[PDB]
Amino acid sequence: YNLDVRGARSFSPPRAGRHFGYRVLQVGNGVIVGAPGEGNSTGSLYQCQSGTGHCLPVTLRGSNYTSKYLGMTLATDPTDGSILACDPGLSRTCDQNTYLSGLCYLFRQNLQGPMLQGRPGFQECIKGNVDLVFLFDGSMSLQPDEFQKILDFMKDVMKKLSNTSYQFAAVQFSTSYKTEFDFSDYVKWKDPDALLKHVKHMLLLTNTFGAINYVATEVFREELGARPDATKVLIIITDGEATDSGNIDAAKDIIRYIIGIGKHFQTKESQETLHKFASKPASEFVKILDTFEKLKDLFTELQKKIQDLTSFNMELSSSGISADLSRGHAVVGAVGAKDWAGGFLDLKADLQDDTFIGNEPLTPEVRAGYLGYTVTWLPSRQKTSLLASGAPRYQHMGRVLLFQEPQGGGHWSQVQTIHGTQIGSYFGGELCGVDVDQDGETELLLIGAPLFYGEQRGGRVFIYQRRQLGFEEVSELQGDPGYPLGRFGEAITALTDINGDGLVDVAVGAPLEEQGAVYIFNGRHGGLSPQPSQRIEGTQVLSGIQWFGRSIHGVKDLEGDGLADVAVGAESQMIVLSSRPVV
Amino acid sequence: QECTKFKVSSCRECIESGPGCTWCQKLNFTGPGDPDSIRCDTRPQLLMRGCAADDIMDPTSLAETQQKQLSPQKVTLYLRPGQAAAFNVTFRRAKGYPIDLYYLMDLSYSMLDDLRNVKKLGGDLLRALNEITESGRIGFGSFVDKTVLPFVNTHPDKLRNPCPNKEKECQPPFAFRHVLKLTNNSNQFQTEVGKQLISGNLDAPEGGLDAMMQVAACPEEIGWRKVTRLLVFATDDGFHFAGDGKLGAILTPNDGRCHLEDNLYKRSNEFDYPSVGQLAHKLAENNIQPIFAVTSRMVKTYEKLTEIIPKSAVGELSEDSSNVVQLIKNAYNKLSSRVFLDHNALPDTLKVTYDSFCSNGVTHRNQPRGDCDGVQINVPITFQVKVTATECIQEQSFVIRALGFTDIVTVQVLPQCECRCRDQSRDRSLCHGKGFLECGICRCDTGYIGKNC
Ligand SMILES: *[C@@H]1O[C@H](CO)[C@@H](O)[C@H](O)[C@H]1NC(C)=O
Ligand SMILES: *[C@@H]1O[C@H](CO)[C@@H](O)[C@H](O)[C@H]1NC(C)=O
Ligand SMILES: *[C@@H]1O[C@H](CO)[C@@H](O)[C@H](O)[C@H]1NC(C)=O
Ligand SMILES: [Ca+2]
Ligand SMILES: [Ca+2]
Ligand SMILES: [Ca+2]
Numbered sequence A: 001y002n003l004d005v006r007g008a009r010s011f012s013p014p015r016a017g018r019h020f021g022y023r024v025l026q027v028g029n030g031v032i033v034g035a036p037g038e039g040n041s042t043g044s045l046y047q048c049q050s051g052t053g054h055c056l057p058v059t060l061r062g063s064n065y066t067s068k069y070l071g072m073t074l075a076t077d078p079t080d081g082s083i084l085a086c087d088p089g090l091s092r093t094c095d096q097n098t099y100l101s102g103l104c105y106l107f108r109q110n111l112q113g114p115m116l117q118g119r120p121g122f123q124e125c126i127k128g129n130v131d132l133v134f135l136f137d138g139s140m141s142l143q144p145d146e147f148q149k150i151l152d153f154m155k156d157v158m159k160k161l162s163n164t165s166y167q168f169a170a171v172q173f174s175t176s177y178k179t180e181f182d183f184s185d186y187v188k189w190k191d192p193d194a195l196l197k198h199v200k201h202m203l204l205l206t207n208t209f210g211a212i213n214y215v216a217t218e219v220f221r222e223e224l225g226a227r228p229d230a231t232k233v234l235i236i237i238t239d240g241e242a243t244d245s246g247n248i249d250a251a252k253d254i255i256r257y258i259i260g261i262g263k264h265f266q267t268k269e270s271q272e273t274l275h276k277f278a279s280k281p282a283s284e285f286v287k288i289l290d291t292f293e294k295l296k297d298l299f300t301e302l303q304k305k306i307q308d309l310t311s312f313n314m315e316l317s318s319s320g321i322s323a324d325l326s327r328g329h330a331v332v333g334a335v336g337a338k339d340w341a342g343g344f345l346d347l348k349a350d351l352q353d354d355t356f357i358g359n360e361p362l363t364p365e366v367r368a369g370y371l372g373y374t375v376t377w378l379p380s381r382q383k384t385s386l387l388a389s390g391a392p393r394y395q396h397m398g399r400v401l402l403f404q405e406p407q408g409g410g411h412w413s414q415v416q417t418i419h420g421t422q423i424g425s426y427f428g429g430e431l432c433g434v435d436v437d438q439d440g441e442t443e444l445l446l447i448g449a450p451l452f453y454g455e456q457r458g459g460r461v462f463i464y465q466r467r468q469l470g471f472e473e474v475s476e477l478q479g480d481p482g483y484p485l486g487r488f489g490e491a492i493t494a495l496t497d498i499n500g501d502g503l504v505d506v507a508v509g510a511p512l513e514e515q516g517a518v519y520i521f522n523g524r525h526g527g528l529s530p531q532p533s534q535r536i537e538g539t540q541v542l543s544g545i546q547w548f549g550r551s552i553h554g555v556k557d558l559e560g561d562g563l564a565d566v567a568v569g570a571e572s573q574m575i576v577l578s579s580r581p582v583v
Numbered sequence B: 001q002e003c004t005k006f007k008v009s010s011c012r013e014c015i016e017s018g019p020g021c022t023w024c025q026k027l028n029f030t031g032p033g034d035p036d037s038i039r040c041d042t043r044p045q046l047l048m049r050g051c052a053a054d055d056i057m058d059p060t061s062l063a064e065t066q067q068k069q070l071s072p073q074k075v076t077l078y079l080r081p082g083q084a085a086a087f088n089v090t091f092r093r094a095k096g097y098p099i100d101l102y103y104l105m106d107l108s109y110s111m112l113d114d115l116r117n118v119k120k121l122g123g124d125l126l127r128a129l130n131e132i133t134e135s136g137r138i139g140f141g142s143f144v145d146k147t148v149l150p151f152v153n154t155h156p157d158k159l160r161n162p163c164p165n166k167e168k169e170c171q172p173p174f175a176f177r178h179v180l181k182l183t184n185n186s187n188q189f190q191t192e193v194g195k196q197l198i199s200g201n202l203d204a205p206e207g208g209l210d211a212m213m214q215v216a217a218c219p220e221e222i223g224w225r226k227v228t229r230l231l232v233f234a235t236d237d238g239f240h241f242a243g244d245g246k247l248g249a250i251l252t253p254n255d256g257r258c259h260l261e262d263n264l265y266k267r268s269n270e271f272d273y274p275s276v277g278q279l280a281h282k283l284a285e286n287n288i289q290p291i292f293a294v295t296s297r298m299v300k301t302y303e304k305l306t307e308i309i310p311k312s313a314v315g316e317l318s319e320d321s322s323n324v325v326q327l328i329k330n331a332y333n334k335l336s337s338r339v340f341l342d343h344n345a346l347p348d349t350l351k352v353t354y355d356s357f358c359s360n361g362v363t364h365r366n367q368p369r370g371d372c373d374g375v376q377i378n379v380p381i382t383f384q385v386k387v388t389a390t391e392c393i394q395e396q397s398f399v400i401r402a403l404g405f406t407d408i409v410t411v412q413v414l415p416q417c418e419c420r421c422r423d424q425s426r427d428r429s430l431c432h433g434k435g436f437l438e439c440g441i442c443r444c445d446t447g448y449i450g451k452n453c
């Protein structure tokens, strides 16, 4: 009973939709509110001022797209103050198919400051008709067997794609460039051995910038057989760094893969030099091969990846449907991955690259599980930092997976599985990590099951504590009975310390208990208190309110009067409460 | 056998103090310096103090019970705090009512061969219902999923033909369509269900829970009688529920209301899928018992729903739905051989447990719900209901149902904190004063001066 309900403030723009308040986030003197659009409206973000009492829509600067999904995903980094916003409603058509993935925005300073953006888990459109050009290195470094293996690679790719809508062209490049055959030359023959039998190894330098500009302006020409309705794809094959410099702006509309082969790409620094030539993300389009014989192993990856889909990889990934930031590291969930098995994307700091981590192994039982619906960092200092992600639909019951950060030179590994027991309960539909004693080790993982049904209580929140072997279930946060569909657990947040005892406290939203309610659970010695110290009825703050407790955020607030400020979302409303020593 | 006493100055406060406290009513039982609080103690302690056995006031919780399937219909209880009263409810399973069977079918593309078989089963279904009881009716509805991405491909060509491209008689995807109001005319089923085309969608879980909710929320359009209500749910994989709509940016919860327009659930993209518990609640209210007819690989998943929807059954549907009539007969037997005895919401001043004495050879005791399996027609089973109050309660009531049936037991709860002592007759001349004599202690009419008036 440290939250001053009598002093509550409320915020609502005049044109606010029903889902203004779907997410709330407190940054100095303001609240950021995610407002996903309903019906035909598009979503938006609102910056709400503590002083003026007004909420204003945020103009995304240099953004090309805004769907109704904008506002669904707001996260902030406690270590550096970064804000990540995501719009997981980027839809596009590729022949008769529709793709759906996310667009994410990183505000390093504040919403008015510089913005970075990216498309995590983005699948480029590869149509039925593809105009593909091979641009192969002929530099003086290639021995004749190595140059030949490059020739044979292009042949097997053409051979495996012979009865498709693909049309091919080939350009050798060294100091200068020669078209070894145009698209028309491929249509009139379709014989790879014949098309390339006049190829003579140039034995000079490696002018990659000029080569790419040459391909974009002198090869993709309609009078040479290029189809303007086809996807333009470029496969670059090189064994050394570029000997020129400039830009490839003339080729930016081309989907560009690049393959670095051999001893000259031993260092990660040299491999990095190929990134400016290829499309993003470099994890998809930049292939480093240590030996020339591995050009055969690459045949599947660079061609099976290259219309009626009944089975989907990342085309319907729904990336950015959740996010979390810790210590400068951002991750977003992608529930659609691998036919809605799910997973998460480990983002590069500039949002220009990503790494997908998902279920392992892909078994038929992970399908339609929606892993990555929730993602929550569990940082530690002495122990390894973990990431928890819920698959609330796993086998219609849900589960939570614990992933360990890459340790040393290693990779992400999955270290624990936590099973839900009740069908439809959405076990893992909400997650929250808590470091109660603030020793730098996050020991508590809270798992919401907001749809849990039975015993006259709607929804559950379970407490898991980290032991040596893994997380063990130690307690439950008890909500009031009498609301069997009340969705206790839909929102869980750590409030920092609200009652000045040095221990972190937790809030739990229960948005469908009458007009909504928020429970406050105080931190104690050795964990969390299972009984709440306060319950805040929405009806008390506003009379016509609904969904009170749909989202909660707490922070030690630096301006104003009080120990902590707590923001609570509701239907078309956002409410701010101050924590006080004596209420 | 234990009594803790704090405030006792009357017989009624003694009983209120606990279930083990008793009150002596002997006249002139108290010494000059003693209070009449010594008059309230445990039975052995009172006997220690010279009170005779017949002068010991020791109330006991009592139940007053007043051819039916559920007997008795009305019971009045008298509860002293801390002591339970017990009464037996008898369930004698009668003969079945007429059966309304609404057949709700998945029409995504893998159900194409199932659709061709179901189009010809209208006769067999009515004949099956009339082999069970009398005067059956059948209805029909269909579902695929919500019509937003990524549940369906919203490309205009794939909306017109969600089915694979070869398919030539295919309807756009849809959430729920009410095809046939409950009727006893099988030819109506044939021509109405025959008009339906196969459809398709994008992701494996389907939106059948949307359709079930609309069926349970629209009783006038569906045509339910007040007889046995069966809802066959025929599908061949999983189902969406609340929270999944987020992928389509559908964040408003299901409101559990009827939304049929032109026999379609048009606003399905305005509301999220219902939660399982939300649907279980709606099905219990309206007495609608679902029969999940699912393929073999889904059976273990759908069986977990019977955990949460008490009156439901699961049967293994064939890949072409050709066994569905025997599936429904088996499911009826399983549904009606199971009997739950439950009560509505209670004040927490009361607690109710059930003993279930079953005829199949099983006995449960002290359970929040009565549960017997293997119940047979005209073979009675007995439920012992025990009700305990923690305090002197205000007059109240609560109903006891048999799940799936409308018969109720109305339990009137009355407090018994009053002592029921004796007549002051033979003792008049009373307290040497005006006051009257209750329970061996004089409560003098307000004032004069004195405990002894
Ligand atoms: C948005 O589109 C414009 C084209 O008008 C382009 O110049 C810009 O690079 C695009 N933004 C991003 C982030 O790619
Ligand atoms: C109810 O019946 C059971 C078994 O037939 C019996 O043991 C019990 O005494 C009965 N209860 C009452 C209150 O008569
Ligand atoms: C069928 O239901 C109708 C109501 O539409 C009723 O009139 C009729 O008696 C019932 N039985 C038969 C055999 O039609
Ligand atoms: Ca800690
Ligand atoms: Ca605290
Ligand atoms: Ca089939």
Ligand SMILES: [Ca+2]
Pocket: B144, B145, B151, B201, B202, B203, B204, B205, B206, B207
């Ligand atoms: Ca579906």
Ligand SMILES: [Cl-]
Pocket: A139, A140, A141, A142, A204, A205, A206, A239, A240
């Ligand atoms: Cl070279």
Ligand SMILES: [Mg+2]
Pocket: A137, A139, A140, A141, A142, A206, A239, A240, A241
């Ligand atoms: Mg070279």
Ligand SMILES: [Mg+2]
Pocket: B106, B108, B109, B110, B204, B206, B237
């Ligand atoms: Mg299907």
